[PDB]
Symmetry: D2
Subunit: 295 residues, 4 copies
């Protein structure tokens, strides 16, 4: 046998960092879950039980804290690159680092129409993630995204003209409920090193806000008959507003709402134009994926 | 042996309702999970295997759907009362109905700084619930609540002066993080019947908004060395602002954030006054409860 | 206002203990999640923010570990009584201690047809729990239970004879799938103190086994048209076999499996006597409860 | 801009099938969750909102049910093949079918020392899965695995001799607790088509049982200084017991049990040789992976 591939590291490392302003007295908090996986000349740890090439995962957890203490944790795209570079630079035998970061929401509270200096609320289970691959000699690869974004539109969505055969029973519709969770991922053009990443810092937070805004707006305004076409319009706008992006990827898990026919009960009308009460379905669910690039 | 208590019904009944305004064309959606358990002279289903006294759980389901279609599903406190009343009025042997409703958040999307007519977002995992108890010849008991409200304050929270013995290792503190999930419940005075509940409708949504605002404010502004003291303050205000309320119950699971001593590494200062990076703890967690009533 | 009720303590405290047999060298492991809530003269901590009467929840945690170290953690009924007793006896202003324990399975591995001395496998997600209420001058109250026991019988289950009205659409059946999670609890007669509990120790593990065996046996053998009737028989046998038990309580959340009509496709027969493929339903579900006592 | 990649289908389709032996009266049940994703000339559905090329997800669901009714659902490897094949063979514009199947346990109950004819128990949250990729003109690729296998050994596990530096605080140990959730996947050699998969049907259940056995036994008996070394040995044996296997992948999440120092309480000894009470840690956790293949050395 032979080791064709190997990674290892620490997962689920929860980190919280606070920023205090001595002047204004305002405080800002950052909470995220980090995962670091290493690659390199560690083959013997598997084949010869040689631990000498092993940087303890516990030490990888230590490095994460230490790094967050000496560096800025925002934007996550930067912090990830810093954390990733450290490993391939500090350890001669390590040649790849894979960093995953999940950012939780801690939105500043508004008390009496005013932003509180030190109170926060988790206003959503929506996440801002980044997957940064740092490979020796090959620069830095970044993949930004947002997930856990749940949306619904009560009308202005249709579905007809689809293939029909001996396996179809679905009835075409010109009005229906469209609900889904949004997983959007934008891949940045390869970066040569930390210095290049550092120089584009301003673009990160901006592009994210751009991705979020485009998604919501397009979703809300688009009177579709093809979820596929809807997400394609979403990817176009993103690619157009940010030149540094190489590809945009969407993954929309459809959430179905069934009509309930109650006519059997005193001629109760609750279908088609009279549909008012629906039964949300936990499963199954449609899944539509999409990767869009430049011509 | 003998049956001392029995209940049965349908759980996890997902429901969705949409209200359309022909005039403006603005739509509104409601989604919730309903549970209905029944009580009465049904012992024989257990003892003699007699089903004749059993109202099918599938029919309880049908009923929930029908009820929603024929009535207003908001406020929940009202809808719950109607649904519970239905069973004791339609069945001779049914003497009590216990309805549990969980309302999910579908916040209206703001596009271009203007509310969208038919697009929604799940802006939180926070819920608004109700527990209605309809008992023949004893009125309707209603318990309202809000849960899943997660907050954190980076300062202005202390803890000192607590009991100290041979089992204590916790050091006193005058500045720490305070994070928790909020579970607040207010119990209304017993209503005589559907009519009376219908007469106080406007107080349900208002009392809920009030309970929410007081919790958020008190938490944010109170600088106490006692989570206990803070929650009592919240209950006080709620009881003072709504006379129709008998008791207010709070249950706060204290989520801890530990200081990370990094001194062992090049004398890095990250404790006490220099504490910037913390480690969130998934478990365990303090749990503080409290039921406040009137003198 | 006035404090009607108050509790507080530590929750989700994970504990693991290993017992090494000094003769054979065989190791047995125990793992469980503990929760401890205290009651007593602590009102002032809420009304006057007086922390002097507060035993830190951190100390509560510490006490759990220490107690586990100096005492046997099995059976959980004993360990819960020891832990509960400690708090009311060590603190004068503490009058009640509510201990909840969840036991996780760590089944010994059989390797090559022989029990391994120190390797375990988490076979089920089924738990064994205990709730122990230790109240000063009122003895020790113990509620044992098993939960998370999932079973299914493809046949020998019926449902017909139930009530039928204008809300009924369900067809009666004489063959159907019965699946459900099992939640069984057995209340022990009130115990005077730790001394009494200790003397009845051998009865705890035994009865749990009995409850589990009866539940499984009855469910599999009973050919009934009433779940309610099946659970009652379960309760009966448990009360007959153990006199120290006062009441048995079952809570069965049904899991439905619908037939799938496939006649629209080449007249495929998949209903009634030809039903082979079914569609498991996540929700909603029927919930049947029952508390049985002695005449 | 342009469409680089595109898939779509039905996810989380729960299925239950029962087999009744009219002779013996013994019934056997099967439950699984299926996911089917399709690929092909469907770019227009994105670029020009053309649903004409779209096979409704609802119809994909119906198809799973029909296929389940007309064919065996065991072993999963076979069923996934039968299902993926159907799509590329029935739709000219559909070129690839990605089928994911999760198998839920329903173990027959033993009552009074004998197996019950129609009663089962969910004796574990452990699962048996398969990922089948049917591509037009490329054959059938199969990835079988087992997951959710949680194990723990209270001793006979060590960790010393690792790299130490200014970021290191961990102390060396010669006796510790080793617990982990096992995730094992074995890739089969490419199959030309359905007929070839059918011929090998018997190897599927046999290899699954071998992988599970090898995993448990090795975990139990190995006294290794590294989880890496222990998972390598497991892969070795599996590759050695089945020649149709090309690679074996292992993903082990080391769950930690920390010692608790109680000496601050009357000098109570609870560390090292005296350790009895441990604190299980929910997070974070170590994560070790590795893909083992066949050597080129003769
Ligand atoms: N087995 C094992 N234990 C560890 N503990 C900390 N790091 C490691 C590692 O790489 N392997
Ligand atoms: N066994 C059983 N099946 C049901 N199906 C619908 N309602 C019921 C009920 O009360 N018991
Ligand atoms: N606020 C608060 N913090 C604690 N930390 C430890 N115990 C307690 C308690 O009772 N209240
Ligand atoms: N939008 C949309 N709705 C569907 N409903 C069933 N299949 C589909 C699909 O592919 N797209």
């Amino acid at each position: 046998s032979a080791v064709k591939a190997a990674r290892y590291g620490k997962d689920n490392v929860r980190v919280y960092k606070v920023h205090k302003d001595e002047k204004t007295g305002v405080q800002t908090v950052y909470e995220m879950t980090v995962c670091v996986l290493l690659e390199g000349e560690i083959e013997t740890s598997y084949t010869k039980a040689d631990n000498s090439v092993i940087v303890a995962t516990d030490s990888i957890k230590n490095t994460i804290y230490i790094t967050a203490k000496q560096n800025p944790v925002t934007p996550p795209e930067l912090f990830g690159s810093i954390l990733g570079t450290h490993f391939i630079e500090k350890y001669n035998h390590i040649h790849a680092a894979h960093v995953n970061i999940v950012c939780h929401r801690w939105t500043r509270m508004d008390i009496d129409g005013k932003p509180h200096p030190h109170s926060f609320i988790r206003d959503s289970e929506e996440k801002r993630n980044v997957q940064v691959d740092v490979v020796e000699g090959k620069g830095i690869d970044i993949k930004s995204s947002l997930s856990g974004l749940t949306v619904l539109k009560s009308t202005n969505s249709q579905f007809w003209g689809f293939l029909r055969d001996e396996y179809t029973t679905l009835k075409e519709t010109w009005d229906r409920i469209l609900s889904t969770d949004v997983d959007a991922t934008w891949q940045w053009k390869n970066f040569s090193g930390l210095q290049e990443v550092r120089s584009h810092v301003p673009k990160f937070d901006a592009t994210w806000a751009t991705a979020r805004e485009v998604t919501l707006k397009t979703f809300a305004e688009d009177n579709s008959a093809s979820v596929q076409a809807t997400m394609y319009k979403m990817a176009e706008q993103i690619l157009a507003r940010q030149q540094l992006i190489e590809t945009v990827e969407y993954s929309l898990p459809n959430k179905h709402y069934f009509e309930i026919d109650l006519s059997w009960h005193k001629g109760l009308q609750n279908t088609g134009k009279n549909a008012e009460v629906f039964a949300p379905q936990s499963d199954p669910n449609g899944l539509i994926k999409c990767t869009v690039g430049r011509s």
